[PDB]
């Protein structure tokens, strides 16, 4: 269906097809060399060049090799450098280049390619949308917003652009404004809109404004396979792991860790209190837009399975104690952190990103009244020197209505049913 052959490539269509035949039959090495031969004999042929690039792409998959893929990425660029490239081929080649650059994590590279694509095909909305995603992937939400604003100024009902514009609005705490975009975008059914991130954030935006319909969106998102359940809405999962909002120490099997935290809780407390008194800047304000009101800060010792060595200078005995416990210090999808919350705080219902961790809370300074935590349909309280354990992939909510501060220690562990193999392999979060 796409027109990939310029005047000269039609005259060599038989050689080009012979080479492509080798690739589709999976004889990648013979195909690479066939297209190399063609490139040598016709160094200006765009189709030969693209064939070389595609073989390199398949070869990188075969060998699971980033270096080979970097080669393909340059060859996709060479296609675009050549004279007289058909438009369909130019677009395919540079689109694939950008997609593979992102796969390698070369987000700035991809962004340049996507900027080139939009300059070349100024009327192609899909490419402007793809450019916005490039900006989102490097964290440049300001530029992404400008991109989707442009798309929407010309195609107001582009559903991809709507859900992404809503995502950005929601991330900027423009909660009410984001709802119609997220909802209309999802309802559009356009390609790219049936994504759990948009169900997640529409339901959450609705919860925050007191809209009764949030859970209809959670229910639909579960029906469409994005959520394990209405209550458990994490999006980076291993399917099959036991799903329970509240866990006992014995259920987790990490009984030695719980015993050490409870037997040694006062030293953990005291180092936190010392940091609060003498190094308060190690406590950093929560910054994921999870508070309705109030004050909540965290002092993080491990994140993504990596010890923060300066932070551990502030809690050296605690860090020494925890090092005996690789189920938490090597939990590359969780953290180890102190968490202080003050009266007048309400943490919004929310879900963590992954079902691969369980969250332990050790009480350190717990006022006698006013502090509680809900996970799914059950609310509990903390106790000094005692551990609670919940699955924070379930929706949870916290209130602090005491008359003094409340300090806990948070210790994430790998979900117990994850094998050593998965624990070594899952990408960090």
């Amino acid at each position: 269906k796409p027109k990939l052959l310029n005047k000269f490539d039609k005259t060599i269509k038989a050689e080009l097809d012979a080479a492509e035949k080798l690739r589709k039959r999976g004889k990648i090495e013979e195909a690479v060399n066939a297209f190399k031969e063609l490139v040598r004999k016709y160094p200006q042929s765009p189709r030969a060049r693209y064939g070389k690039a595609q073989c390199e792409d398949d070869l990188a998959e075969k060998r699971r090799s980033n270096e080979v893929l970097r080669g393909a990425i340059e060859t996709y660029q060479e296609v675009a450098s050549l004279p007289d490239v058909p438009a369909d081929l130019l677009k395919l080649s540079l689109k694939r280049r950008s997609d593979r650059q992102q796969f390698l994590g070369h987000m700035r590279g991809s962004l340049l390619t996507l900027q080139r694509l939009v300059q070349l095909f100024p009327n192609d909305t899909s490419l402007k949308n793809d450019l916005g995603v490039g900006y989102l992937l490097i964290g440049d939400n300001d530029n992404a917003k400008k991109v989707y604003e442009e798309v929407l100024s010309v195609t107001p009902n582009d559903g991809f652009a709507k859900v992404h514009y809503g995502f950005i609005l929601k991330a900027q705490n423009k909660i009410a404004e984001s709802i119609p975009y997220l909802k209309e975008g999802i309802e559009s059914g356009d390609p790219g809109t049936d994504d759990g991130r948009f169900y997640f954030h529409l339901g959450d935006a609705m919860q925050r404004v007191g809209n009764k319909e949030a859970y209809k969106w959670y229910e639909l998102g579960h029906k469409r396979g994005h959520f394990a359940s209405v209550w458990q809405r994490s999006l980076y999962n291993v399917n099959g792991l036991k799903a329970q909002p509240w866990w006992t120490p014995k259920e987790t099997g990490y009984t030695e860790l719980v015993k050490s935290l409870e037997r040694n809780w006062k030293l953990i407390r005291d180092e936190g209190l010392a940091v609060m008194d003498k190094a308060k800047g190690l406590f950093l304000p929560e910054d994921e837009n999870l508070r309705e009101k109030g004050d909540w800060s965290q002092f993080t010792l491990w994140q993504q399975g990596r010890r923060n060595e300066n932070a551990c200078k502030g809690a050296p005995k605690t860090c020494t104690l925890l090092e005996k416990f690789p189920e938490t210090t090597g939990c590359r999808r969780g953290q180890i952190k102190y968490s202080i919350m003050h009266p007048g705080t309400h943490v919004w219902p929310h879900t963590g990103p992954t079902n691969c961790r369980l969250r332990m809370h050790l009480g350190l300074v717990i006022p006698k009244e006013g502090c509680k935590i809900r996970c799914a349909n059950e609310t509990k309280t903390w106790e000094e020197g005692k551990v609670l354990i919940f699955d924070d992939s379930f929706e949870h909510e916290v209130w602090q209505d005491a008359s003094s501060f409340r300090l806990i220690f948070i210790v994430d562990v790998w979900h117990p049913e994850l094998t050593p193999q998965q624990r070594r392999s899952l990408p960090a979060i």
Binding site: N66, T354, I429
Partner: peptide, 18 residues
Amino acid sequence: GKCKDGLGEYTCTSLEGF
């Protein structure tokens, strides 16, 4: 930008090829 307690970033994992 990391997803520590929530899911507020467009993507929570890092791209590092194969």
